[PDB]
Every structure is written in C-alpha cells, then in structure tokens.
C-alpha cells in the first residue's frame, strides 16, 4: 500500500485458465493490491448476473480496454457520473499474467532523471 | 394416427373460441393456471343486490 | 401525553362537560319530538343530572363485574373500559343506547384492544345469564361495538393512571431519602385512585398529575409532605410558577373527592324504573 | 426511404476510426460538472414532549435498586427486556403530561 | 366515491378513489372478517391495533389513519395512496441497479423505526413488503396489524410472530419476552436483501430457518450471551466454523460492512439501537443519500 | 395438484363474480351487459381449460410411466460416460505418476 | 370423472347466460346469475370431489393448453421422447456389441491360444 506503482501481484492457477472473458475475474481474485472491494464489479458479483448494470449504475467500474489474446490484457478504472459519462482514473496492464500499474508519463521521467543525475 | 386433432374433438361441446390462445384472449382472469390465485375469501351466497344490478332491460 | 392523540380529547374545564352532556340530552329529545312520535315535553323525557346518577351507580356495578371476571384482569383493562364508557355518553343519551349493552360492549372492545387475548368460554362463564339471553346480548354487542368506535371518533388509546404511579415510586426510591419505604403510601394512594377514577378527573386533569396528587394526599394523611420533591420538580422550567398550578390542581381534586358520593339505591331504583319504561317506549328507527 | 431512414448516410463518412484503430481521437475534451448534495438528514434529534425529562441509561440509584413488582429474572433475561427497558418505559410514561 | 378496485387483502379489501368529500386521491379500506358465527368476536385484534396505532403514530416516515367512518356494518379506514413497494421494486430483474439509492431507502426506513421506538410501541411485523413507496418516494412504514406496546408490567407477550424468512434469533428460540430486538434484526434482513438482491436466509419452516440463520452467522459464541441455550427452547445447532459478513454479501463499502455487523450482533442486548444506527458515521459520509427527487422509479 | 388448482380457480371465479355483482348496479346498465358477457367469456375460458385438464386426467399415468422410462435411460447414458471418464482418469493421471 | 360433466354443464349454463344477457329479456334473467352462483356451489362440491380425486398434473399440460392444442400432443411428445431415448441407448449398446465382436476377432487373429482359453472360459 506504500506505492501502488511499485507492486506486482500474480497467481499461477489462473494463469493457464486466462481468456478475454476471465481477465476481469483475474483482477477480481481479491487480495490483489491494484483492485478494491469498493469497486462495483464486486458489488455486482455479490448480486446475481452482470449486463448493462454498469450503465444503470454509474460508479467505479473496472473494464477491459484493449486485449491481445495470448498475454496482453489492459484494464481501465472509470468513475461514471451518469450513463454516457465516463471519467478515466487509472490503467492497470497485465503482461504475461503479471499485473502492473501504468506509469505516468511524468512520475516515471522524474524518477529516471533523479537516478541518472 | 393424426395427433393434430383440434383443441376441438377435445373441448368440442363448449361454445365460443375454445381453440383461441391465452395471449389472444387478453383476459386477466385467464392468467390463473400458470400462477395459482390466493383463496382470500370463501365462496358467498347470491344476494338481491346482484339481481337488482342485472335484470337485463 | 406528549404522544398527542388525547391532546385533542382532553376537555379543559368543568363547564364544557356539563354543557355537552346537556346538549346531547336536548338532541335526543328534539329528534324524537320532530319525528313526532310524541307531543313536546311529555313525562317520559329524562333530566341530565338524573341520567348521570343512574350512569354512575350502574358503572360501579360494571366495575364489580370487571373485578369478578374469572380470568385475572390487568388494572389497565378495567380502566380502559371505564374511560371508554364515560366518553361514550358525552356524545349521546342514556335512552338512545341502554346502559347494559353499552357496559358489556365497552368491556369486550377494551379487552380486544389491550391484548388480554380473552378466551371465549371465560367471557361467557363470567356473565351470570342464560346462554340464549347472553347470545341475544352478544348479537347486539357486535353492532354496538362498531357504533361505539364511530361515536368514539376512532380515538381508542386511553392513558391509564397506573404506569405513572410505579414510575413516581421509583423516583421516590432514588431522589429523596426524606421519606422512607413508601408502601403504606402505596396502599393509601390506591384507595385515593379508585375514588379519583369514579370522578370526571380522568377527563379533566393530566393522569401523571393525578398520580402525583394521590401520592401527595397519602403523604398528608400519614405524616409526610413532599415540599422537597415538589422542590426537585421546581429544579425545572417556570422557576417559581410551576408550584402554584400544582397546588391549585391538588386542592380542586381534594374538593371533588370530598363532594363525590355513591348515589342512594332507593333513588337509583326509581330512576331505573323510569328509564326502563323509557326504552320500552316506541323508538323504531327507519325502513 | 432514401431520406426517411439512413440508407447509407452516416455509413459513408466514417472518419477513419476512433475506437479500434486508436482511442486518441477524443481530443475535444470537457467536464465542469457539479451537484453540491451530500450529508442530508444525518441529524436524529426529533425529540418532542410537553413533559419533564429522563435519561435513557440509568446507572443511578434506580439501576442499583433494580427492583420492580418481580424485580428482574434470569431465564427470561435471555429474552432481553432487561428491567432497564422496564423502568424507562415506566417513568417516561408517568412523566408524560403533568401540565396540559 | 369508490373509483378503483385494487383488490382484496389478508383480512381486508381495498379500493382507490376520492371520498364523499375532496377530490384528493386516497386508498379506502373495507373491513374483512369471518362473521359466520352467531357469536362473532366483533372486530379482529389486528384491525383494532392497526387503526389506533396508525392514528397515534404521526411522522414523515409513518402512514396514518386520517379519516375513519362506519355507518353500515362496514368500517372504513382512510390511508394515503402510495406508488408501489420496495419489495417488488428490488424483486424485479435489475431495471435501474443503483447503489446510493439503497442507502437513501435505508435512511428513510431507519428514521421511521426511530420514531416508532421513541413512541414506545414495537412494530411487530416489518416484513420485506409491508413497506410502501410513494410518488415522491419518501418511504413510510405501513402494515401495523401485529404490533403491540412494550412495557414494564409483566404480561403474556405474544410468541412466534414475524414471517419465517425474516425472524429474530431470540424469537426463533422460543423466548417469552422481547425488546426492540425483533425490529432491529428485521431491518437488518431487509438491508441484506437490498445488497444481495435475493432474500438472505431461506427457511421453509421454523427449524430450517433457525439452522440457516446459524449457518449465515456461524454458531453463536459461548461468550455472546450465554443462556442463549438457557432460554426456554434451544437445540444445539450445527457447530459451523462460521463465515465473515464478507462471505455472504461479498463486498461493498466497509461502513456498510459495519452497520451490518452491528445490527446482526447476537446478544439482544447489543443489537444496535435506532439512534445508535443513525449516529453511525456511514450515513454522514462522502456518498450522499438520494433526496428522492432522483429516486429510481420502474414502470 | 389439480385439486388445488380447481379450488383456486373456483375461488378466483367467485371473487371476480362478486366484484362484478358489486359493480353491477354501479355500472351503466347498457354497457354493463357488455361487461357481463366479457366476464362470461372469461369464465367460459377458465372452465374449458379446466375441461381440457380433466380430459387429460385419463392420460396422466402413461406420462408418469414415460417420465420413469426417460429417467432410467438418462441414468444409463450417465453410466456410459462415467465409465469412459474413469478410464480416462486412470490412463492420464494415475499411470503417468 | 363427475367433475368433468359438472363443469361442462356449468360452462353450458354460462354460455346460455351470456346468450340471454346478450339479448334484451322480458323474463327474469336473474335466473341466469342464480344458476351461475349455483354452478359455483356445485363446483365447490366438485372441489370436495377433487379432494376425493387427488389429481396430479405437470405444468407443461397447462402451457400447451395455453397454446390451445390438445394435451394429447403432449402425450405423443412424451411417448416420442421415450422412444428416442430408447433408440439412442439401444444403438450405443449395439455399437459396443459390434466392437466387442471385432476386438475378439482381431485378438484371436493375433493371440491364438489366449483367446482360445478365453472362449473356453467365456
């Protein structure tokens, strides 16, 4: 919880059973630093089924953004004020079943310049 | 034998469109076999007020 | 009753009650005369004070009937019934509904509201009447039950002067040690409470104040006065003003109790014969 | 129907792509949203009366006395209804009123 | 003037319309009973309680007996017409699945419960339904048939009362006495349903419902309120390892997690109180309770 | 189960007829005749579908035997697939180790 | 049994009542409503008779009645599914029979003495 950018979380069983449908579930395995119980995808799982309910509701909805079938699966965290209103919060990208948080174009550069100098 | 015997030869004696489906009937009362109605009140006897209400013309 | 409801049904002072009873007597008299069954001011029509005396003696008989109920009865249920009966004749006349039917009905409705869950055999067993005659009365009881609520304005809750008594005694066991073991105080207070209940006190005074006054009368009779307790209530709003109102109410209560007396049976039987003849007179309602 | 419905109108111009090809076609961004509506009716004080007053917890001589017509009893205590509920109802009701 | 026939009821029949007087919309009740006995018990206890209790309980979150008449055998009770009911609303397939709206419904229900507890009169039978939503959406409580006063004097306290699915654990045992506990545990099961979307604990009949109540919260600890088996009728239930609230409703904001843990606490003594629950910081939080202007409406 | 449906149908019919008789004096009589014949159509449809039920009541036991047959053959199909499954679990799990 | 004829007479009385109340009638047409109420009473007697009869019926009968067909079609479909399952199961057992025969043929080709002793033991 010190720095979310500097944490990586994984799990071998879910690795072979990974598909475009299951990426959200892998992020949802719980005990995963990046995702949170507060997210509504978790509230939905407590209830029955999942459909246009993320549009009926308008809140924290982790949604897959871009997907490459074998490994690459990018997830985006949105905060909706209303249907047809989306506010992007952050992006967590999964490479080879390893979840990282997408570095800001500027926090990365600041740290980089600091180490070199 | 032909098994498309009409909902007639089956229910033949009753007059009216017995063959017509429940959707076509559009009757709230008909929707009853699918979900059982509650027995809120026991059957009551006929009253003079009913006959006064009808009596045709 | 900070719970409102009885805030509307708390008649404020002696004269209004007198006036209301008088007016209902006039009302029945007039409806009957207009119907024209009789010429105006015949002998049969009663007088309001006589009607009130008959009601009080018959109500003492009704209280004995509540006491002899075979199942044990909470004091709350008896009280609820009496109050309901007094409030009923503040809207109508003795002749329009015979007092016997009204008493029995107030009692059954009361039991149903107060959750005594009475058993049907227990109620029939208590009445000393033939089963057929008790069933005839029960048929009337049904119609007169609905009639009661209609003329009761559907205001059913009744505040019973008991709960406050237990409460003040617990305050007694805690805030003031000047008096001690106030249980002699308890029985005398009960004696004052039955006498208070027979009066229009339920209608006029506040019930909590009624319990406090019973406690004060018991204390004065036995040798203690609660100036100090009155002083803890003075530890409150109105500064000095609260005490004068409390003293005036206490004095008026003492006066009514000393003046109130049971009506003599010799007078009461004359009245009974007259009323009986009265309901035996032709009313008949409508087709 | 050429004018009534689409009939290849918005299907012709497609502006390359702005969903699969690249999600950087947004450009024209906007927000400035407000509501100012939170923390409403948290307050629970609706207390009404025409009477003197009495506290909910006793922790006083009344609790120390712990005595009613039958005082308190153990088996039913599971039932709850600790005499506490008891004296509170009793006193509150008695105090209700006192001054019309 | 009767203008509509919404339908019959458990011990009543209802018609919706404008009365002999003003044109305003209201729901009219007609008394229903088995009068066949030549020795009828007059009016029913449920009716008697409901009418006076509703008349006395006047609150923005309580319905009230307004007008009342009864010239014929008929007894007429006047209650304001309401939009529908939370129960069917959440029962239906997710039409407008929304979250802070559930918190607003919970706030209205809790304010109504606080007023009823203050007036010193328990609502004996909140059930999932029996809660009504109006056009504005202010939800006021309604069915009052089974309620009773709760006081210092010892009296036969009625037993085995609330609908099986929503039942207090002490009542499930067989307890002769009771307190605000029944109403609190029941609001608790209604919140459970709003979050879970389906009923929390299912009981076909008394024993099975007690079993599931225990399976959902685990075996109550000996420390909890020992005498839990010393109340009059107790059967050791299964020795469940137990599941955290996190297990049954998987997730939500932890403040909600805390209200739940609290209404549930087993010792009837600790079941949280109405004032206590409003004072919970969950109500005063960044998520805002809906004013009801934007409250969800189905058909 | 048909006894419960018969009782519930008779109850709903008598209750709807009670509502119709209650509004019978209330309704305008000329159009009330139309509402009466509409209700008569409702009752006729309820009763003819109950007539279809009590017609099929002779054919109930054969469908009970058919359900028994279908359950039995489904059980034997699950036996075949279970045998093949346990042989696969022998050949790929236990013998490899 | 008797419930069929009773409800049939009730339905015919309902049809005659609809016909009569459809027509302007000088005669007291309240007899139609009284016969309808008496038919409801006889249907309550038939409900006592249905407590005597105790019929258990599946829901798909109700649903095919909603479609307005014969329930005899539901009987034919249950019979057809019974024969479909019996055909499939007999076919699987027949392929196992042919496979066992082929296997013992080929093993008797490749292992003479062993399949000889097996055909001896059976």
Curated annotation (Swiss-Prot), chain A:
Q: Where in the cell is it found?
A: Nucleus
Q: Which family does it belong to?
A: Belongs to the Mediator complex subunit 6 family.
Q: Quaternary structure per UniProt?
A: Component of the Mediator complex, which is composed of MED1, MED4, MED6, MED7, MED8, MED9, MED10, MED11, MED12, MED13, MED13L, MED14, MED15, MED16, MED17, MED18, MED19, MED20, MED21, MED22, MED23, MED24, MED25, MED26, MED27, MED29, MED30, MED31, CCNC, CDK8 and CDC2L6/CDK11. The MED12, MED13, CCNC and CDK8 subunits form a distinct module termed the CDK8 module. Mediator containing the CDK8 module is less active than Mediator lacking this module in supporting transcriptional activation.
Q: What does this protein do?
A: Component of the Mediator complex, a coactivator involved in the regulated transcription of nearly all RNA polymerase II-dependent genes. Mediator functions as a bridge to convey information from gene-specific regulatory proteins to the basal RNA polymerase II transcription machinery. Mediator is recruited to promoters by direct interactions with regulatory proteins and serves as a scaffold for the assembly of a functional preinitiation complex with RNA polymerase II and the general transcription factors.
Return the protein name. Mediator of RNA polymerase II transcription subunit 6
Q: State the species of origin.
A: Homo sapiens
Its taxonomic path starts at:
Eukaryota, Metazoa, Chordata, Craniata, Vertebrata
In terms of the parent sequence, the fragment covers: 7 to 123 of 246
Curated annotation (Swiss-Prot), chain D:
Q: Which residues carry this modification: Phosphoserine?
A: 73
Query: Where in the cell is the protein located?
Result: Nucleus
Tissues in which the protein is found: Highest levels in colon and testis. Moderate levels are present thymus, prostate, ovary, and small intestine. The lowest levels are found in spleen and leukocytes.
Source superkingdom: Eukaryota
Q: How does it assemble?
A: Associates primarily with CDK7 and cyclin H to form the CAK complex. CAK can further associate with the core-TFIIH to form the TFIIH basal transcription factor.
User: Its biological function?
Assistant: Stabilizes the cyclin H-CDK7 complex to form a functional CDK-activating kinase (CAK) enzymatic complex. CAK activates the cyclin-associated kinases CDK1, CDK2, CDK4 and CDK6 by threonine phosphorylation. CAK complexed to the core-TFIIH basal transcription factor activates RNA polymerase II by serine phosphorylation of the repetitive C-terminal domain (CTD) of its large subunit (POLR2A), allowing its escape from the promoter and elongation of the transcripts. Involved in cell cycle control and in RNA transcription by RNA polymerase II.
Protein name, entry field:
CDK-activating kinase assembly factor MAT1
Q: Which organism is it from?
A: Homo sapiens
- What does the record give as the organism's lineage? Eukaryota, Metazoa, Chordata, Craniata, Vertebrata
Swiss-Prot record, chain F:
| Cellular compartments annotated | Nucleus
**Placement of sequence motif LXXLL motif 1:** 20-24
Instruction: Tell me which tissues or organs this protein is expressed in.
Output: Ubiquitous.
Q: Which family does it belong to?
A: Belongs to the Mediator complex subunit 14 family.
How is the subunit organization of this protein annotated in UniProt? Interacts with GATA1. Component of the Mediator complex, which is composed of MED1, MED4, MED6, MED7, MED8, MED9, MED10, MED11, MED12, MED13, MED13L, MED14, MED15, MED16, MED17, MED18, MED19, MED20, MED21, MED22, MED23, MED24, MED25, MED26, MED27, MED29, MED30, MED31, CCNC, CDK8 and CDC2L6/CDK11. The MED12, MED13, CCNC and CDK8 subunits form a distinct module termed the CDK8 module. Mediator containing the CDK8 module is less active than Mediator lacking this module in supporting transcriptional activation.
The task this protein performs is described as: Component of the Mediator complex, a coactivator involved in the regulated transcription of nearly all RNA polymerase II-dependent genes. Mediator functions as a bridge to convey information from gene-specific regulatory proteins to the basal RNA polymerase II transcription machinery. Mediator is recruited to promoters by direct interactions with regulatory proteins and serves as a scaffold for the assembly of a functional preinitiation complex with RNA polymerase II and the general transcription factors.
Name under which the protein is recorded = Mediator of RNA polymerase II transcription subunit 14
Gene coding for it: MED14
Please indicate which part of the intact protein appears here, giving the first and last residue numbers and the full length.
50 to 146 of 1454
UniProtKB/Swiss-Prot annotation, chain G:
Q: List residues traversing the bilayer.
A: none
* Subunit structure comment from the entry: Component of the Mediator complex, which is composed of MED1, MED4, MED6, MED7, MED8, MED9, MED10, MED11, MED12, MED13, MED13L, MED14, MED15, MED16, MED17, MED18, MED19, MED20, MED21, MED22, MED23, MED24, MED25, MED26, MED27, MED29, MED30, MED31, CCNC, CDK8 and CDC2L6/CDK11. The MED12, MED13, CCNC and CDK8 subunits form a distinct module termed the CDK8 module. Mediator containing the CDK8 module is less active than Mediator lacking this module in supporting transcriptional activation.
Alphabetical GO biological process terms: positive regulation of transcription elongation by RNA polymerase II; positive regulation of transcription initiation by RNA polymerase II; protein ubiquitination; RNA polymerase II preinitiation complex assembly; somatic stem cell population maintenance
Q: Which Pfam families does its entry note? A: Med10
Q: Which GO terms describe its cellular component?
A: core mediator complex; mediator complex; nucleoplasm; nucleus; ubiquitin ligase complex
Write out the entry's keywords from A to Z: Activator, Nucleus, Transcription, Transcription regulation
| Protein name, as recorded | Mediator of RNA polymerase II transcription subunit 10
One GO MF term on file is: ubiquitin protein ligase activity
- Coarse class of the primary localization is nucleus
Keyword Magnesium in annotation = no
Gene name, Swiss-Prot/TrEMBL: MED10
Q: Which family does it belong to?
A: Belongs to the Mediator complex subunit 10 family.
| Origin superkingdom | Eukaryota
Enumerate the subcellular locations listed in this protein's record, separating them with semicolons. Nucleus
